[PDB]
Design an enzyme around this catalytic site. Structure first.
Site, PDB file in Angstrom:
ATOM      1  CD  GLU A  57      -5.560   8.980  -2.638  1.00 41.19           C
ATOM      2  OE1 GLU A  57      -6.694   8.596  -2.992  1.00 41.19           O
ATOM      3  OE2 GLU A  57      -4.771   8.251  -1.999  1.00 41.19           O
TER       4      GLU A  57
ATOM      5  CE1 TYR B  72      -4.064  -0.822  -1.330  1.00 39.64           C
ATOM      6  CE2 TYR B  72      -3.771   1.154  -2.650  1.00 39.64           C
ATOM      7  CZ  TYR B  72      -4.347   0.508  -1.578  1.00 39.64           C
ATOM      8  OH  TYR B  72      -5.217   1.184  -0.752  1.00 39.64           O
TER       9      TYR B  72
HETATM   10  C1  LIG Z   1      -8.585  -7.416  -1.489  1.00 36.79           C
HETATM   11  C2  LIG Z   1      -9.658  -6.722  -0.639  1.00 36.79           C
HETATM   12  C3  LIG Z   1      -9.072  -6.267   0.685  1.00 36.79           C
HETATM   13  C4  LIG Z   1     -10.167  -5.563   1.481  1.00 36.79           C
HETATM   14  C5  LIG Z   1      -9.818  -4.111   1.759  1.00 36.79           C
HETATM   15  C6  LIG Z   1     -10.987  -3.223   1.375  1.00 36.79           C
HETATM   16  C7  LIG Z   1     -10.983  -1.751   1.712  1.00 36.79           C
HETATM   17  C8  LIG Z   1      -9.831  -1.160   2.448  1.00 36.79           C
HETATM   18  C9  LIG Z   1     -10.236  -0.071   3.397  1.00 36.79           C
HETATM   19  C10 LIG Z   1      -9.659   1.331   3.274  1.00 36.79           C
HETATM   20  C11 LIG Z   1      -8.820   1.733   2.061  1.00 36.79           C
HETATM   21  C12 LIG Z   1      -8.244   3.154   1.897  1.00 36.79           C
HETATM   22  C13 LIG Z   1      -7.408   3.465   0.660  1.00 36.79           C
HETATM   23  C14 LIG Z   1      -6.771   4.835   0.421  1.00 36.79           C
HETATM   24  C15 LIG Z   1      -5.915   5.079  -0.824  1.00 36.79           C
HETATM   25  O1  LIG Z   1      -5.712   4.098  -1.866  1.00 36.79           O
HETATM   26  C16 LIG Z   1      -4.829   4.134  -0.661  1.00 36.79           C
HETATM   27  C17 LIG Z   1      -3.342   4.709  -0.538  1.00 36.79           C
HETATM   28  C18 LIG Z   1      -2.904   5.048   0.920  1.00 36.79           C
HETATM   29  C19 LIG Z   1      -1.876   4.039   1.561  1.00 36.79           C
HETATM   30  C20 LIG Z   1      -0.796   4.793   2.385  1.00 36.79           C
HETATM   31  O2  LIG Z   1       0.061   5.354   1.760  1.00 36.79           O
HETATM   32  O3  LIG Z   1      -0.878   4.889   3.590  1.00 36.79           O
HETATM   33 ZN   LIG Z   2      -6.180   3.852  -3.805  1.00 41.56          ZN
END
Ligand SMILES: CCCCC/C=C\C\C=C/C=C/C=C/[C@@H]1O[C@H]1CCCC(=O)O
Ligand SMILES: [Zn+2]
Ligand SMILES: CCCCC/C=C\C\C=C/C=C/C=C/[C@@H]1O[C@H]1CCCC(=O)O
Ligand SMILES: CCCCC/C=C\C\C=C/C=C/C=C/[C@@H]1O[C@H]1CCCC(=O)O
Ligand SMILES: [Zn+2]
Ligand SMILES: [Zn+2]
EC number: 3.3.2.6
Lengths: 608, 608, 607
Positions: B295, B382
Site C-alpha cells: 500500500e 500483480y
Molecule cells: C487487468 C484488469 C483487471 C480489472 C480489475 C480492476 C480493479 C480491481 C478492483 C479493486 C482492487 C483493489 C486492490 C487493493 C490492493 O492492491 C491490492 C492488494 C490486496 C489483495 C489481498 O491481499 O486481499
Molecule cells: Zn495494489
C-alpha cells in the site's frame, strides 16, 4: 431467492404459518387487546430448532407448546419494523412437521395498527370505537406473526367485547354468545377458510348497525350513517357481478362494507369479507363509487393473487386499478374508462413531480431495504402499474384480449404469492404467439427505471376536452376576461369533469388571487361537499394565497383523516406563509387524537 | 486514442473535472449519504453544450450552475456500470472554459461502494460504522462523477456525522466543529491538494481512536484494536523512508493507517493519506507487513502514476508488487525478496490454472468491454506484471540499474494517467543503449497472450529449498512413512516458510485423509492464527475431505470478509459434498450483512 | 517485391487457397461473429508458424485438426492493424496444406464496415450493413493474408435476421431458416474464381431486385430499385462490349447493388456484385461511365490483379482505358476523346493539389508507412490512363493497342503482377516496335512525380463549345453579363454542362456578380445531376457566395461519396463565412459517417 426486507420473522423457506386461532378481549378501559394467538406452523426444513416472529409494541406474557411454556427472547427494536421474537422449540422439527405455538400477549395503546376512539369521537357520542389497519406491516402490532405477505394462513377468532357493542372481522361471522366469564360482555366468533396474508386480518368494534343492499352484502356503520351509506353504495352488487365476469368466481362468501369514522386513513381497505371505506365517499350522488369497484377488485388482484413482498406492491394495485376501471367502463361506458385512465396518468405526473424524476420510489418495482412502507407509499404503483397494463392492452390487441390474460393470470396464481418475474413469465407464456411484440417493450425502463414511463398510452379525449378548455380559459385569462366567466360555464359538466377541471388547474397553480376570488363568485365551489372536488378546490385556493380559504382548509384537514386529503392540505398550509404557524399549531393540538400512522406522517411532512 | 469501457461519462478529451467540493451528511438511520457535489469542469472542445457523468443508484435532486437549476436526464441503467446522467449546460462552452456544477444527490442503502455496519457488527458494540471502497468503478455509487482513472482532480470535503463518531477521508484532516444546524452532529473537514483519480476517494465514519507510530503516521481503529495495530505495523515509517529512496519524494503529506472491520474485502487499499487495511494482518509478529509495503508503494505507482483505464491495471499493481518486494528485500535481505518473488510466481500458476491457460483474463493487458472489473479481478496483473518487471531487471543489468529506470519512470509520469504504450515507449527511451536487448523480449506474448509468461525469471532458492523438501516428503509419503514426521520438522522454518510449505502442498491437493490427520497431530496447524497459514491449511483440509475442518473453514470464511480468503473457502466448501449444503445455507444466512461486492461474488461462485 | 501494407507471411512463405466463412450478423451489438477456415499451403520446408493480418478483431481460439493451437496477437501498427502469429502443431514441408479454423468477432468500429440504423435507410424500418475492403480493410472483417498477391476461392454461410437479405461477392448458393434460431436465415455463397481478399464483400439489409439483363439483377431498397433498373439499363450492352474487348466474362453473374448514400465511392467492382453510389441516379443514364468502369474491373483488377498496392495503377489505369473504349463504342470516338481530355483535366487538378514533387503523383508509388486511404487519388487512374492513351497513339492506334490489352489479360488471368511484368509483356507483344518503345521516357512516366512528360493528342470537337462558353464568362465584364441567356445551353449535353463547369472551376474564383448571373440564366440550382451540382456548388463557394453555403453543406452530408464530400467540406472550411458551421456539421455527423470518410474528412478539417 426472494427476501422480504420488511419482515424480521423466519421466512417462508424455513417455516410457514398455516392457521391462526385468535382468542382475545377488547378492553376499552385500558385501550388494549389481550389474548392468545395460536399459530399452526409447519417446518420447511430438517432440524428446525427455533423460529422468529414479528412483533411491534407487544407485551408477551408466555409462549406455550404442547401444554408447556417455552423459552423466548424479544430482540432489540428495529424502528418501524418492531422487535423480533425468537422462540426456542422443545424439540427440533423435521421437514413438513407441524406444531401449534400459543402466545399470550397484549397490545400497546399506541399500537400503530389500531385507533381507539372515545365516545366523543364517534357519531353516536355514547359508545367508544376501535378499528384496525394492518396493511402493510402493522399486523405485528396486533399479534405475533410472520408479518410478510409471502405466507397465507386461514384463521378463526373469538373476540370478547362489551355486550352493547358489535365486533366484525375480515371473515365469515360464526355466531355470538354472552361471555361466560363476564355478563357485561359478549363473544363474537369468526372463521376465514380462504388462506390470506396476515395484512388482511382486520377488526372493528363499535355501536354498529347494518342494512342489506345485496344478496351477499350488508353495509355497516353507526346508525347515523347506515342508510346514507346503503344508498351511496347501491351499485355494489352490480359491480361484484361484473368483477366475477372479469376475474372468475368470488370465493369469499360475503362482501360486506363498513363505513368507518372520518379518521380512517385510506379511501378503502379490501379486508376479505369486509371492505373498510372512508365516510368521505358519501358525496350524496354515488359519484365516488370507483373506490368501491377498486376494493371489490382486490377480491381477485391482491387478496387471491398476492404480492410476495411489498417490493412488488404494483402487482396488487396496478391490476386492481385496471379491473376497477373496467368495472366502471362496463357501468358507464368505454369513454368514461378512458377519462378515468387519463386522469390517472395526471396523478402519476403529480406523484413523479413531488418525488423527483430520479427518485427510487418512482420505480414500478421498488427496493424497500431500510424503507418504511408507509413513507414510500404513493400513487406510483397504482398508476404506473395501471399505465403498463393499459399500454400492454393496446399493444396486444385490445381490452377483450387482455382481459383474457387477466382472468387466466388470476386462475394461475389464485391463493399464491408471486413476484414481478412470475407475472412477466406468465405474460410471455399466455401470449406465446406474440413474443415478438412483447420483446419490443422496454421492460427494464417500465419495471426498474425511475420517472415517467418510457411511453404514454393512447386515451380517448371525449370527456376530457371540456375540462382542458375551461382550465385553459382560466389559466390564460386576464383582468378583462374575468367578467365573462359565469355559472353557465359548468352547465354540461359532471362532478367528475368538475374534479378534473380543478385537477388540471391545480397542476398550474398558483393562479392570480383575483382569478380565484372570481372563481368562487361565479362557481361557488365553497358550497360543494364532494370530498374530491373540495380537496382540489381548497388546495387551489391555498396555493394561490387566498387567506379566506385557510379556515376551510384547516377544517377539512382535521375533521376527516383520509391521508390523501389530510397530508397535502397540511403540506399546502405549511407552505403558505400566512397559515404556517396555524398549520403546525393545529397539528400539535390534534395529533394525540389522530390515527397513529397519519399522525406520524403529518409530523414528518411538517418537520416537527 | 484509448477508450475507458467501464465508464459512461464524457471522456477526458471532451471535458475534465479539475476539483470536487463534497458537502454531505451521513445518516445511519436511513443508511444514506446526502449532500452536494460541486464539480469544477473544464471543456476540452468548442461548442460543448452538454456532458455526461457516471451515477449508480444515486437520487439526483437538482443540478445548479451559476445559481440556477439546469436541465438533466438520467439514462437507462447499464447493469454494473450504473446510469448515465446528461447535464444540459445553460451556455455552450469553448475550449478551456470552466464551470462549477453543483449536484444535489442522495446515495442508496444498496450503494455498492459502501458497507453499513450495525453496532453489533463492530468491535465496540455501541456505535455503527461506515466505510467506502471505490476501486475500481464504485465512486459513481457515492457521487456523480467522471468515474474513470483518466481524470485527476483535487478535492475538499465537509462531512456531517453524529457527534459520537469520527470521519476520516483520503485527504489531510482540516479540522472539526459542532454542526451548526444540528447539535447532535459534528462536521469534519478535509483537503486533498494532490490531483487523484476518483477511485481514490474514501470515507470512513465510526468510533475511531488513534496511536502515533511515526512522524507522519497515525494508526486508526476502534479502541479494541488500536494498540495491537500500532505494534503490528511499527515498520511503517522505515518502509516509507525506503520507498522514498526508491520512488522519489512522498508528496501526500500524511501516511495514516486505518484498520477496518473484518468485512473489508481486500488486504489493503492505498487511499491517499489513509491506507485501509484488513484486521487479518494482525498476526502478532509483524509477518504480514508486505501488505503495508504494498500500500505504501501505491503512493508512487498507482496514486501518482495512474493507469489511464482498467485495461492497463497491471501498470498499477505490477510495479507496486515490484516496489513492495524491494522494500522487504531492503529490510530482510535479497534472499527474502527472491523467496517472495518465487512464491508470487506460484500464485500466478494458481491463477492461470483457475482461469485456464487460454482465458482472456490471464493476459497482462486485458479488454474489459462488457466485463465487470470486480469479476475479472485476479492476481494475474500483480504477478504476471511483477514477473515481467523482474525478468526485465535481470535482462537489463540487475536491480540497481532497473530501480533507476523505475524512479525516472515515476518522475516522468507523476500526476498523470498512462497506458502500457506510454510505459514501454519510455522503457525504450530510458534504455537507449540496450534497444537490441529489449528487442529480444517477446512483447506480443508478455503483453497480449494468455497463460503463463513465455519465459520464467531466475530465482534464488536458498529460503525455498526447505519448503520444497518438506512438501515433497509429505506428498510422496506412504502410510508407513507417516510416523517419521515430527514437530521438529518445523524447527528451522519461519512463518513465511510454513506458509510456502502449505502453498506447495496445496498445489498437489488432495492428500490422503490419513496424511492430513497426521499433519495436524505433529504440527498442530489448527492452533495457528496467522490468517495466511490458516487459510492455506484449511483449504488443504477441506480439499482432502477432512470433515473435522468444515466448521473451522466456515468460521474463517464468515468471521472475516477478505475476498482472498472468503471466496476460495466458500468454493472449497461448496465442492466438498459433505459441506455443500451448509456452505450454501451459511452464505444465504449471512449475505444480507456482507459487503455488497463480496456478497455478489460469493453468490456467483456458489451459483445461487 | 514486398507488400509494405501487410503484416502477414508473404506468398513466398505460404498461400491461402480457400476461405470458408461461417458468420452471424448481430445488429444489436454491431458485430460479425463466426469462423474463418483458411486452407493454407506452405511454400517452404520446415514451416512452423505463420502470421495473418487482423485489425480490431477479437480472437476466441484457433483450431487445426480438431485441436486448439497457440497463437499470439501482436502490437498494433496503426492503420495496418495487429499481426496474428499462429504456431503450427507440426512443421509443414513444401506444398503441404492445412486448414486453420479461427473463431473471431469484429469490432463495431471496424474500418471495413458501416452499420446503419433504420433511420439511416430509405425504408426506415430495418437496419443495414455493407462492407468495403479495398485496399486493406478485409483484415478488419476476418484474419487473412490481406495482400492482393494471394488469390483464394471462398464459400460462405451468413446468418441474418430473417426479414433481411444477404448478398456477397459470389454466386448465391441458396437460403434456409437458421436451424439454431428461428428468427434468422442463413444465406450461402460460392466464389469459384480465385480472388484477392480485398474483393470479399458483404451486404445485409431490406433488399429487393429487378432483372435488367440475362445475367444482371439490380439490388437496392424498394424505394430505389425501379429507378436504378432504369438508370443502369445499358449494363448488358456494356458487358457485351467489354467481353469483345477483354475476352470472356468468367464470373457467372454480374449483379448491381445500389447502396445507401454513405457509400464512400462511385463504385466497387466486387465480383458478381458491383456496388454503386446512389448519386449515379441522375434520371437520364448520364453517369453510366461508372458502370462501364466497374464492369471493366472484371478483367483489369479482378482477373489481372496488382501484386501490391504500389502498382495500383495497373488496376485503375487499364480499367479507365477500358471504360472509355466501352463508352466510345456506345457513343462515338469523339466522346471517348472528350472523356479522355476531361480526365487529363482532373489529373492537372490532382497534381496541382498535391504539388509537382509530391510522391503520390508518381505512377508507381512507395506505400511504406503510408495508409492507402490517405494516398488514394485520381493520379493512378488518369496518369495511368494517360500513359496507355499515349502508347496507343505511339504504337498505331486503338485497334492495335486493344490487341495488346486482350493478350495482356489472357496472359495474366487469375494472377497478380507488377509494373515490370506489364512492361516486359508490352515489350514482348510489340517486338517489332522496340525502337518506338525505347523512345518512351519510362523513368519519367512510371517513377517520377508531377505531370506526365508528354501530353496525348485529343479530339476537341465536343470540348470546344465548353471552352468557348467558359472563356466568355471568365473574360466577361459588367457590360457583358446581360448578354448571357438560357439559350447558351440549348446545344450542350449534360456531359458538356459538367465540363463547362469544370473549366470554369479551374479559373475560380469568379466575380460574385458573375455567379449570381449564372444562376439567374442557367438555374444550376435545380440540376440534381450529382457531378454537375458538385462542381456548381464548389464554384459558388469558392466565389464567396453565401447563399450556396446551406446547399453545399446539404450535399456534403446527405450523401457520402468522398469524391463530393471531401472537397465540399474543404471548400466550406476555406470560406470564412462557412468555416465554423462546416467544422460543427462534421463534428455533429462524424459518429454516423462511414469510418473511412469520417477519418479523412477529420484529417482534411485538421480536427
Ligand atoms: C487487468 C484488469 C483487471 C480489472 C480489475 C480492476 C480493479 C480491481 C478492483 C479493486 C482492487 C483493489 C486492490 C487493493 C490492493 O492492491 C491490492 C492488494 C490486496 C489483495 C489481498 O491481499 O486481499
Ligand atoms: Zn495494489
Ligand atoms: C411501491 C411501494 C410499495 C409500498 C407498499 C407500502 C404501503 C401499503 C400500505 C397501505 C395500503 C392501503 C391501500 C388501500 C387501497 O388501495 C388503496 C386505495 C386508497 C387510496 C385513497 O383513496 O386514499
Ligand atoms: C497508387 C497507389 C495509391 C494507394 C491507393 C490504393 C487503394 C485505395 C483504396 C480504395 C480504392 C477504391 C476504388 C473504387 C473504384 O475504382 C474507383 C471509382 C470510384 C471513384 C468515384 O467516382 O467516386
Ligand atoms: Zn388497492
Ligand atoms: Zn477502379
Amino acid at each position: 431467492e426472494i427476501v422480504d426486507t420488511c419482515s424480521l420473522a423466519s421466512p417462508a423457506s424455513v417455516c410457514r404459518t398455516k392457521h391462526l386461532h385468535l382468542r382475545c378481549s377488547v378492553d376499552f378501559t385500558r385501550r388494549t387487546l389481550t389474548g392468545t394467538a395460536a399459530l399452526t406452523v409447519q417446518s420447511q426444513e430438517d432440524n428446525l430448532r427455533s423460529l422468529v416472529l414479528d412483533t411491534k409494541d407487544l407485551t408477551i406474557e408466555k409462549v406455550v407448546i404442547n401444554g408447556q411454556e417455552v423459552k423466548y427472547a424479544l430482540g432489540e427494536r428495529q424502528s418501524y419494523k418492531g422487535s423480533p421474537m425468537e422462540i426456542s422449540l422443545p424439540i427440533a422439527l423435521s421437514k413438513n412437521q407441524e406444531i401449534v405455538i400459543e402466545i399470550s400477549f397484549e397490545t400497546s395503546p399506541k399500537s400503530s395498527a389500531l385507533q381507539w376512539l372515545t365516545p366523543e369521537q364517534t357519531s353516536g357520542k355514547e359508545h367508544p370505537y376501535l378499528f384496525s389497519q394492518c396493511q402493510a406491516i402493522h399486523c405485528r402490532a396486533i399479534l405475533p406473526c410472520q408479518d410478510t405477505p409471502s405466507v397465507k394462513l386461514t384463521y378463526t377468532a373469538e373476540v370478547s367485547v362489551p355486550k352493547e357493542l358489535v365486533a366484525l372481522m375480515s371473515a365469515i361471522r360464526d355466531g355470538e354468545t354472552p361471555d361466560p366469564e363476564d355478563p357485561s360482555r359478549k363473544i363474537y366468533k369468526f372463521i376465514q377458510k380462504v388462506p390470506i396474508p396476515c395484512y388482511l386480518i382486520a377488526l372493528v368494534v363499535g355501536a354498529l348497525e347494518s342494512r342489506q343492499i345485496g344478496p351477499r352484502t350488508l353495509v355497516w356503520s353507526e346508525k347515523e350513517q347506515v342508510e346514507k351509506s346503503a344508498y351511496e353504495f347501491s351499485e355494489t352488487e352490480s359491480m361484484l357481478k361484473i368483477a366475477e365476469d372479469l376475474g372468475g368466481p368470488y370465493v369469499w362468501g360475503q362482501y360486506d362494507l363498513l363505513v368507518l369514522p372520518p379518521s380512517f386513513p385510506y379511501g378503502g381497505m379490501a379486508n376479505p369479507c369486509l371492505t373498510f371505506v372512508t365516510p368521505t365517499l358519501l358525496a350524496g350522488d354515488k359519484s365516488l363509487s370507483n373506490v368501491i369497484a377498486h376494493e371489490i377488485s382486490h377480491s381477485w388482484t391482491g387478496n387471491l393473487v398476492t404480492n410476495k413482498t411489498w417490493d412488488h406492491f404494483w402487482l396488487n394495485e396496478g391490476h386492481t386499478v385496471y379491473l376497477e376501471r373496467h368495472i366502471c367502463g362496463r357501468l358507464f361506458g368505454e369513454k368514461f374508462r378512458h377519462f378515468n385512465a387519463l386522469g390517472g396518468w395526471g396523478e402519476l405526473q403529480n406523484s413523479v413531480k413531488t418525488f423527483g424524476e430520479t427518485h427510487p420510489f418512482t420505480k414500478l418495482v421498488v427496493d424497500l431495504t431500510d424503507i418504511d412502507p408507509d413513507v414510500a407509499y404513493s400513487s406510483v404503483p397504482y398508476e404506473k402499474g395501471f399505465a403498463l397494463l393499459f399500454y400492454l392492452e393496446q399493444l396486444l390487441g385490445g381490452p377483450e384480449i387482455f382481459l383474457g390474460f387477466l382472468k387466466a393470470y388470476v386462475e394461475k396464481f389464485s391463493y399464491k404469492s408471486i413476484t414481478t418475474d412470475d407475472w412477466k413469465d406468465f405474460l410471455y407464456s399466455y401470449f406465446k404467439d406474440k413474443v415478438d411484440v412483447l420483446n419490443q417493450v422496454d421492460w427494464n425502463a417500465w419495471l426498474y427505471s425511475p420517472g415517467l414511463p418510457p411511453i404514454k398510452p393512447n386515451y380517448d379525449m371525449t370527456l376530457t376536452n371540456a375540462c382542458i378548455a375551461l382550465s385553459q380559459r382560466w389559466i390564460t385569462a386576464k383582468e378583462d376576461d374575468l367578467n365573462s366567466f359565469n355559472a353557465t360555464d359548468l352547465k354540461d359538466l359532471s362532478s367528475h369533469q368538475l374534479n378534473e377541471f380543478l385537477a388540471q388547474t391545480l397542476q398550474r397553480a398558483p393562479l392570480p388571487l383575483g382569478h380565484i376570488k372570481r372563481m368562487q363568485e361565479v362557481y361557488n365551489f365553497n358550497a360543494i361537499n364532494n370530498s374530491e372536488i373540495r380537496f382540489r378546490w381548497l388546495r387551489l385556493c391555498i396555493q394561490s394565497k387566498w387567506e379566506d380559504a385557510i379556515p376551510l382548509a384547516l377544517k377539512m384537514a382535521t375533521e376527516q383523516g383520509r391521508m390523501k386529503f389530510t397530508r397535502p392540505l397540511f403540506k399546502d398550509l405549511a407552505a403558505f406563509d400566512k397559515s404556517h404557524d396555524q398549520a403546525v399549531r393545529t397539528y400539535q393540538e390534534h395529533k394525540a387524537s389522530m390515527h397513529p400512522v397519519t399522525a406520524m406522517l403529518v409530523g414528518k411532512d411538517l418537520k416537527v
